[PDB]
Amino acid sequence: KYGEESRYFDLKDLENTVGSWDMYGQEDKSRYNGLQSEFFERAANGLSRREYILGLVAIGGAGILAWGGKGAADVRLPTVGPQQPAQVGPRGRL
Amino acid sequence: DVAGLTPCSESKAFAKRKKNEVKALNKRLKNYEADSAPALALKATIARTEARFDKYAKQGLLCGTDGLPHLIADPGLALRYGHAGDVFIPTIGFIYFAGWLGYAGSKYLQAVAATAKPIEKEIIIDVPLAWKLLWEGFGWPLRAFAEYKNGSLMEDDAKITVSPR
Amino acid sequence: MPIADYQVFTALFLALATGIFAVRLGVALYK
Amino acid sequence: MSAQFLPSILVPLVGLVFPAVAMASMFLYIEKEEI
Amino acid sequence: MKDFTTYLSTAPVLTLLSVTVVAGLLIEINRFFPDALIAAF
Amino acid sequence: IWLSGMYFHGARFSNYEAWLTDPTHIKPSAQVVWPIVGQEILNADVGGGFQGLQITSGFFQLWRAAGITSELQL
Amino acid sequence: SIVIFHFSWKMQSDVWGTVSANGVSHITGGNFAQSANTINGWLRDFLWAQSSQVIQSYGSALSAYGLIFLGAHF
Amino acid sequence: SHTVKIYDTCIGCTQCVRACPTDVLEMVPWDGCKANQIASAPRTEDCVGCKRCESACPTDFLSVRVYLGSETTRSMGLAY
Amino acid sequence: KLFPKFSQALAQDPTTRRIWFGIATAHDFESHDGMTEERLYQKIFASHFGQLAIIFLWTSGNLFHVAWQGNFEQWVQDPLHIRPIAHAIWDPHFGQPAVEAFTRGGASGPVNISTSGVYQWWYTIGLRTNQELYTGSIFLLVLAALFLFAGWLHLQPAFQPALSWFKNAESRLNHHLAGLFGVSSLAWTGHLVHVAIPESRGQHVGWDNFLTVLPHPAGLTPFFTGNWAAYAENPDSASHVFNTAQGSGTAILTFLGGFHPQTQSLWLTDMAHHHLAIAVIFILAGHMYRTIFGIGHSMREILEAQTPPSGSLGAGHKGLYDTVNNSLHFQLGLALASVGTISSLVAQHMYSLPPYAFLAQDFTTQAALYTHHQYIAGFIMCGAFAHGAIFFVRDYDPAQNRGNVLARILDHKEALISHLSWASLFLGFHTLGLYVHNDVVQAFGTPEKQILIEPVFAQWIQAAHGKTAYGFDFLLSSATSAPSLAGQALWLPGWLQGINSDANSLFLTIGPGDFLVHHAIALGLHTTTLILVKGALDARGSKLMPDKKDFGYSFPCDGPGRGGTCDISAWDAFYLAVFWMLNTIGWVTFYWHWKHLGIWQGNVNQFNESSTYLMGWLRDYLWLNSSQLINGYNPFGMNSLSVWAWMFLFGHLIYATGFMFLISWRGYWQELIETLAWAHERTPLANLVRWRDKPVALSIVQARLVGLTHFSVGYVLTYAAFLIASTSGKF
Numbered sequence A: 001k002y003g004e005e006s007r008y009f010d011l012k013d014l015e016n017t018v019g020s021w022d023m024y025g026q027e028d029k030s031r032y033n034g035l036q037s038e039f040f041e042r043a044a045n046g047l048s049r050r051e052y053i054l055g056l057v058a059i060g061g062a063g064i065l066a067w068g069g070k071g072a073a074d075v076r077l078p079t080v081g082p083q084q085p086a087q088v089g090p091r092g093r094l
Numbered sequence B: 001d002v003a004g005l006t007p008c009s010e011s012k013a014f015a016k017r018k019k020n021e022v023k024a025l026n027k028r029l030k031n032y033e034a035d036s037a038p039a040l041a042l043k044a045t046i047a048r049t050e051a052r053f054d055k056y057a058k059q060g061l062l063c064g065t066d067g068l069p070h071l072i073a074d075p076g077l078a079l080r081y082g083h084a085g086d087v088f089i090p091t092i093g094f095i096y097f098a099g100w101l102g103y104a105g106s107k108y109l110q111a112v113a114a115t116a117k118p119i120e121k122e123i124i125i126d127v128p129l130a131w132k133l134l135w136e137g138f139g140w141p142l143r144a145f146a147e148y149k150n151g152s153l154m155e156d157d158a159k160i161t162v163s164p165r
Numbered sequence C: 001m002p003i004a005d006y007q008v009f010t011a012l013f014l015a016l017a018t019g020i021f022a023v024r025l026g027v028a029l030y031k
Numbered sequence D: 001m002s003a004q005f006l007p008s009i010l011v012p013l014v015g016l017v018f019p020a021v022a023m024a025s026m027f028l029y030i031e032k033e034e035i
Numbered sequence E: 001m002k003d004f005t006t007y008l009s010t011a012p013v014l015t016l017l018s019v020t021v022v023a024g025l026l027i028e029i030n031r032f033f034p035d036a037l038i039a040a041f
Numbered sequence F: 001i002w003l004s005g006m007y008f009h010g011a012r013f014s015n016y017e018a019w020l021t022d023p024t025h026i027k028p029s030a031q032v033v034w035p036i037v038g039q040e041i042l043n044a045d046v047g048g049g050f051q052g053l054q055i056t057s058g059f060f061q062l063w064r065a066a067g068i069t070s071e072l073q074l
Numbered sequence G: 001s002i003v004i005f006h007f008s009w010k011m012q013s014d015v016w017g018t019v020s021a022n023g024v025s026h027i028t029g030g031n032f033a034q035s036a037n038t039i040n041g042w043l044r045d046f047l048w049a050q051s052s053q054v055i056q057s058y059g060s061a062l063s064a065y066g067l068i069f070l071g072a073h074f
Numbered sequence H: 001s002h003t004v005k006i007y008d009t010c011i012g013c014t015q016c017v018r019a020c021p022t023d024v025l026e027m028v029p030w031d032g033c034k035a036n037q038i039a040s041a042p043r044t045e046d047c048v049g050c051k052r053c054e055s056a057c058p059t060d061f062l063s064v065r066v067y068l069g070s071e072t073t074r075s076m077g078l079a080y
Numbered sequence I: 001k002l003f004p005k006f007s008q009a010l011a012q013d014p015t016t017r018r019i020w021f022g023i024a025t026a027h028d029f030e031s032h033d034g035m036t037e038e039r040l041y042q043k044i045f046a047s048h049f050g051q052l053a054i055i056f057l058w059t060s061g062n063l064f065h066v067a068w069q070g071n072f073e074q075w076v077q078d079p080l081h082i083r084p085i086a087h088a089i090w091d092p093h094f095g096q097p098a099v100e101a102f103t104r105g106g107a108s109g110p111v112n113i114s115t116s117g118v119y120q121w122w123y124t125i126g127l128r129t130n131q132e133l134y135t136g137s138i139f140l141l142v143l144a145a146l147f148l149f150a151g152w153l154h155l156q157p158a159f160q161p162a163l164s165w166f167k168n169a170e171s172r173l174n175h176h177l178a179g180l181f182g183v184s185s186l187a188w189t190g191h192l193v194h195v196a197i198p199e200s201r202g203q204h205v206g207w208d209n210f211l212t213v214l215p216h217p218a219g220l221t222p223f224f225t226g227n228w229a230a231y232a233e234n235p236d237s238a239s240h241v242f243n244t245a246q247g248s249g250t251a252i253l254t255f256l257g258g259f260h261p262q263t264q265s266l267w268l269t270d271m272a273h274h275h276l277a278i279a280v281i282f283i284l285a286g287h288m289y290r291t292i293f294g295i296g297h298s299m300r301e302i303l304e305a306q307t308p309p310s311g312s313l314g315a316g317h318k319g320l321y322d323t324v325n326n327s328l329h330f331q332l333g334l335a336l337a338s339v340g341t342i343s344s345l346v347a348q349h350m351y352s353l354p355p356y357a358f359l360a361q362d363f364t365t366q367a368a369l370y371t372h373h374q375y376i377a378g379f380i381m382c383g384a385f386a387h388g389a390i391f392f393v394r395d396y397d398p399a400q401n402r403g404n405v406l407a408r409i410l411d412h413k414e415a416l417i418s419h420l421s422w423a424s425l426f427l428g429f430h431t432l433g434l435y436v437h438n439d440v441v442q443a444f445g446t447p448e449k450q451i452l453i454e455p456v457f458a459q460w461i462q463a464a465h466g467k468t469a470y471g472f473d474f475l476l477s478s479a480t481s482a483p484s485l486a487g488q489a490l491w492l493p494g495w496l497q498g499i500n501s502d503a504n505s506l507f508l509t510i511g512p513g514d515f516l517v518h519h520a521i522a523l524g525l526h527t528t529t530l531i532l533v534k535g536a537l538d539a540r541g542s543k544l545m546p547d548k549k550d551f552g553y554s555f556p557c558d559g560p561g562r563g564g565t566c567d568i569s570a571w572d573a574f575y576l577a578v579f580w581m582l583n584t585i586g587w588v589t590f591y592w593h594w595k596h597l598g599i600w601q602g603n604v605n606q607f608n609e610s611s612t613y614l615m616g617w618l619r620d621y622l623w624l625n626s627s628q629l630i631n632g633y634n635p636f637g638m639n640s641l642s643v644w645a646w647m648f649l650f651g652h653l654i655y656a657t658g659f660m661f662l663i664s665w666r667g668y669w670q671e672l673i674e675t676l677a678w679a680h681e682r683t684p685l686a687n688l689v690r691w692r693d694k695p696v697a698l699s700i701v702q703a704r705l706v707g708l709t710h711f712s713v714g715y716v717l718t719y720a721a722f723l724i725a726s727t728s729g730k731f
């Protein structure tokens, strides 16, 4: 931008004249411990592929069906529980 | 009797309605003096109610099962059973007065349309001319029929602007 | 005589086949 | 009703699994750049 | 005086006066001839 | 002009004097309608031998707080 | 509108009422504290319950309020 | 990208050009009117569709017409 | 960014609008890229197949759910003391009181009470067990799959029908009148004679034994010999019990007329006879147009010959055959108008002449069916006029229709619109004036001053049908009149017995309230028609926009120039007419529901006295019948009506939400969205996430469509909830 004065436009430095700044980014490779980082990158080894990561989400879909067919009954959900008596209605109906 | 309707004179519901209205008015009147302003007003209302019911029963109006007057809107049916004053005669009266006002307005608009500045004549009405045209509008049926048979009451379709289809 | 479970299963399978035909028709319509 | 367990599995499938799958697929398809 | 009569002849003044006169005439007709349900002549 | 109309109506078509003697049972009223087409039914039995429309502007309370007492003052 | 509705219901359920040496008998019986937490309560216990006074005013002094109530709706 | 068209009914008053907020119209020489000039739309890609040019045309009917079509980042007036 | 595969211009849109318009223009095949007439017709044909399959699947699902979780078998034994079950309820959000409150018709758990009347219909056509319903559902499933395969097959080059095949109007009409209408009616008659009639007499006739059961004691001999009268020897006795053999008969083609004393519905033999006569007439009509057998008619010549002399109608109907055959919108508009009118006819005939057993006793089902069909008819009518406008702006050719009825009707469109406006103004002025006059006299405590005009014309027509409640003694009201003596021993006995009874809806008694409400209905119809006709006639252009046809059927506007051009397209006219259609249908349904509410409770005086003024409509109908509905759930508990109360509030919310899109316009939202975009582009952490499509405000036309959709949905949901809750909590 060459903003050394009141010039905020520069074709040779057009990158700085459009406000393309990281503002808060900072490159630094010294932080996470090597032993802990290895454990996590190892745990999430093949889970970096779209098909494989979607498979993990597919497990959540199976859990949803598992809850309806088993989880809902184990938490004693009112819909899966029993019913007590009934009513007749306005007139002589059921 | 026209369509299963009973005359209000022999209608029991009509008499019961009149009795109930007068009874309510007397109940309200009982909470006042004999010559005070509210008492006189209530007595006047009672007299008006009785006169209205008597007039409706005497005029030959037809009452239904609910005891309220019903109007017959059909020529012939109302003319042969004495109910022409229900809708027929009022129709004639309206048509006449409505045509009177409409014809007066039409004549005023056509008369001021020939002036050099008609818009001002429309926002600032000419009272003498409007009065004269209002008086002339009473003969609107004759004038309208004469203009229709004369051909001056209509504008040629070829002279009226129209959309480009 | 209420419908049995096998009847519901058969109806669901036939519905699956119908859905397959429907998706085929939809694919043909998209083209 | 026969097979009381069927609604408990079909309702979540049609209301939770199917809608999520359909929305994800539609979102991925309406922004493909080259279909 | 001419300008005053011209102002009195404007559309709003004439409209309000005409409506007032018609309303007054109708009110007095109903005051002297009340409950006129049908045209009894 | 509006204030003058309010005071005039409270002095000629109201029950303020009667309301002063019984402010807990007499309902304030400052409007009277003419009998033309059955509208006289709007003249409610507010109290104190008076018939009119019940008002909710609070003028009676204001006048009482100011010590009006009489209709001549209004 | 919501402000005035809140004020009306609150005063009719927790302030305005009568004293009978045994307590306070509010106009609506204090249903605001148990029904104002839902929209259905506002529609039924306030709009529907309190509207019976204006829809049943025909034939009385408040008939005008019943007429305007409809006219305004128009 | 809207479609802007100029018709021979134009009188070359140049009002539409002055009313354009994105500089889409211009006056070019012509010989069908007393003004000896006609309007043109060489930069329709910058037209937003405000129709300000039509509100300034005095001919009846309008000599300049704008037909809104495919919307772009410029025709939608988006600054983000 | 290329999802609108059918619109390359829309795919280039970098905003979210691309997605929106990508879904609202998916069925406008004529506007898609690289679209021809042959491909358009083929795509429409395949879409028709898909729609047919969807309808079959829907019917199969209804049958399966009734046979799996309903109480059809129990309802058959007690059709008057058991509430039909629609389907089960499996909602994890339900609480214990909700689960216990929704268990009604002897079900194992929470269920929904049916309101569509499928129970009465299936019971009247012969169905009795759950196995039959399951078999029907499976059959419909197979039929749907077959239609899907047909739709896919006709899309292949070897089975693709040519464009000329779609234009063969004579052949299509011949096959539709003789086969789609006649043969279908004949088959229905066969089913009624072989199953419905025997089943109603306590005799079971199914696929396993229909070949060993005689529909009539004298099988086929009287039919081929000509002694058709032998098929109406002894009909069902007046003391016959449905589904049993007491007081039964052997006739299969009667014409008693009226209603069954026990079921309060039309006789099955009468309906079978009706379908047989209809089938014969339709087949005969089907043998009219010319195909490839040297005989028949040519519609083009018939139209070209319908030119009255003196030039009163101009060129007559010259070129109309091509105008209808070439334009798909013209045919769609005609079909929609006819279908909507038939829907209204169906709604008006099912309540006055119940065709299903024990249907008149189900007050909830009758009201729901009438309201449903009336709303469907209104929407279809609006669509018919909308497509007529689309035709005028996209398929009308002035040179091809020069001098015919279309050009002439367009030549005097001003007179048409002017007279429609005058009729609407007259009806509105007087209906509102009479209602307000009655309201004012009622408020002042003087009901005797009400203007109650007796509907003498409608009463006269009723007397012409046999009603003797008005003392007219006209045609059917006089026993010595020629029409009375002609049908004295045919259908008049039952017809008169049913029309002179106040226990049914066959020509109900009318009074001043009916007069006022009918004029209000006339108002709604006239104004809706005025809006639609004005939009269709002015679609090509008006004085404010002479070249409107150049901008298409739908466009936002024409800018603020020339005084302003908001809502100037034909689409906008249809948009404004939808509100009026909803209002008219609302008035019609309100009238029907209130009258039947008073009739069912044996209190016709309530409607006869409170319907003459609007306060009675608001207090004695809306406020009075809303107590149970709004009490579905309260701080004390909940009942089975809580679903309707929630739907009531839901409809109110949707309607109010639509009010936003209707009142607020695009300008405020665009600036607001720009501010939101700036906020997102400047918020840390969230900067890592970007939008693929630039967020923009809804389009003007899109906003009008969204607002109208919300308004209509809220309207329908609110009325449905109120109607069902009011007529269900009492009966």
Ligand code: CLA
Binding pocket: C008, C011, C012, C013, C015, D006, D007, D008, D010, D011, D012, D013, D014, D015, I054, I057, I058, I059, I060, I061, I062, I064, I087, I088, I089, I090, I141
């Ligand atoms: C259009 C007809 C239709 C409709 C509206 C419904 C509606 C319903 N069904 Mg049902 N069903 C149908 C047809 C239909 N069904 C048919 C023909 C069968 C026979 C196989 C079944 C078998 C069936 C079973 C076994 C169950 C339901 C259940 C249900 C309820 C919960 C939905 C669910 O999760 O189940 C899933 C539904 C299916 C797996 C099959 C339905 C397939 C239909 C035909 C698809 C139709 C799509 C439609 C034509 C296209 C519209 C476009 C749209 C998808 C955007 C719900 C009220 C459940 C229930 O009882 O709730 C308590 C339940 O367990 N249905």
Ligand code: CLA
Binding pocket: I044, I045, I048, I049, I052, I165, I166, I168, I169, I171, I172, I173, I175, I176, I178, I179, I180, I181, I184
């Ligand atoms: C006998 C021969 C025959 C038959 C049976 C049919 C039948 C049919 N054709 Mg076809 N057609 C034919 C010959 C035939 N066609 C020929 C020769 C040609 C070339 C000229 C065509 C060209 C053609 C085209 C281009 C199209 C069709 C279409 C259709 C379908 C119409 C839509 C529909 O299903 O609604 C059913 C209609 C009825 C059942 C009749 C309606 C009766 C009224 C309106 C209903 C009320 C009756 C009653 C009161 C209802 C009560 C029931 C209630 C209790 C539920 C239909 C199944 C359309 C289609 O959908 O494609 C698949 C279509 O696009 N046809």
Ligand code: CLA
Binding pocket: I023, I024, I025, I026, I027, I028, I029, I332, I379, I380, I381, I382, I383, I384, I386, I390, I553, I554, I571, I574, I709, I713
């Ligand atoms: C046989 C019936 C039929 C057929 C075949 C068509 C066919 C067609 N119509 Mg049409 N129409 C019909 C009936 C029909 N219409 C009816 C009954 C109406 C009155 C409502 C209309 C009104 C109408 C208009 C105004 C227009 C068309 C247009 C069109 C064309 C394009 C449609 C389109 O773009 O798809 C797109 C489909 C959609 C956008 C779906 C709409 C979304 C719906 C309304 C929302 C429903 C939400 C749901 C109810 C919410 C449930 C509530 C719950 C959540 C609580 C097309 C050829 C357009 C046209 O011709 O272009 C020039 C056009 O502008 N139609």
Ligand code: CLA
Binding pocket: G074, I421, I422, I424, I425, I426, I427, I428, I429, I432, I523, I527, I530, I531, I576, I577, I579, I580
């Ligand atoms: C309650 C709401 C309401 C009302 C009263 C109207 C009324 C009317 N509409 Mg409308 N409409 C509405 C809602 C409403 N609409 C909505 C929500 C929409 C969707 C946006 C539409 C869309 C619509 C369209 C597209 C059209 C109409 C048309 C009409 C007119 C039809 C002619 C008629 O019926 O004569 C009767 C007239 C009336 C009932 C008006 C009442 C007359 C007043 C009360 C008399 C005045 C007395 C008094 C002096 C009042 C003045 C007091 C003041 C000075 C203080 C009419 C005036 C059509 C039209 O213009 O017709 C030519 C038309 O094309 N409407």
Ligand code: CLA
Binding pocket: B087, B090, B091, B092, B094, B095, B097, B098, B099, B101, B102, B103, I422, I423, I425, I426, I427, I429
């Ligand atoms: C007593 C109370 C009352 C009131 C307050 C009104 C008020 C009104 N009426 Mg009405 N009317 C009434 C009673 C009443 N009417 C009765 C008892 C009848 C007999 C059934 C009618 C029949 C009637 C008709 C036929 C019409 C009205 C119309 C109108 C409206 C305009 C009237 C007018 O003159 O405008 C000003 C006048 C003009 C602008 C020009 C004159 C127009 C008049 C009406 C034509 C008269 C001559 C013509 C040849 C008559 C033939 C009409 C044709 C249909 C046969 C207006 C709001 C008109 C309307 O509804 O507007 C759409 C309308 O045409 N009324």
Ligand code: CLA
Binding pocket: I653, I655, I656, I657, I658, I659, I660, I661, I663, I664, I668, I672
């Ligand atoms: C009942 C009708 C209705 C509703 C619901 C809204 C709602 C809203 N309006 Mg609005 N408005 C309306 C009528 C309505 N308006 C009308 C008639 C007008 C014309 C004058 C306007 C004019 C208007 C303006 C000018 C503005 C708004 C703004 C807003 C938004 C304010 C933000 C907010 O409230 O937070 C939250 C939203 C809500 C509380 C709405 C209800 C949402 C529920 C509680 C959540 C439910 C979750 C859902 C069920 C779960 C998903 C289920 C799945 C099936 C999808 C909001 C969404 C302002 C805005 O843009 O926002 C700052 C704005 O400036 N409105």
Ligand SMILES: CC1=C(/C=C/C(C)=C/C=CC(/C)=C/C=C/C=C(C)/C=C/C=C(C)/C=C/C2=C(C)CCCC2(C)C)C(C)(C)CCC1
Binding pocket: I329, I330, I331, I333, I334, I337, I341, I384, I385, I387, I388, I389, I391, I392, I536
């Ligand atoms: C716009 C448009 C369109 C559309 C249209 C429409 C929508 C229409 C309609 C309409 C309608 C909706 C109609 C209806 C009707 C009806 C009628 C016309 C009737 C009648 C009558 C009669 C004849 C009857 C008789 C009888 C009998 C039979 C017996 C008994 C008695 C009586 C009398 C009832 C189109 C595309 C086409 C064209 C262009 C544009």
Ligand code: SF4
Binding pocket: H004, H019, H020, H021, H022, H023, H024, H025, H046, H047, H048, H049, H050, H051, H052, H053, H054, H066
């Ligand atoms: S519509 Fe607006 S931007 Fe486009 S040419 Fe006209 S004035 Fe210029």
Ligand code: SF4
Binding pocket: H006, H009, H010, H011, H012, H013, H014, H015, H016, H017, H038, H039, H053, H056, H057, H058, H059, H063, H064
């Ligand atoms: S405003 Fe119209 S007349 Fe003037 S230069 Fe532009 S196109 Fe021509």
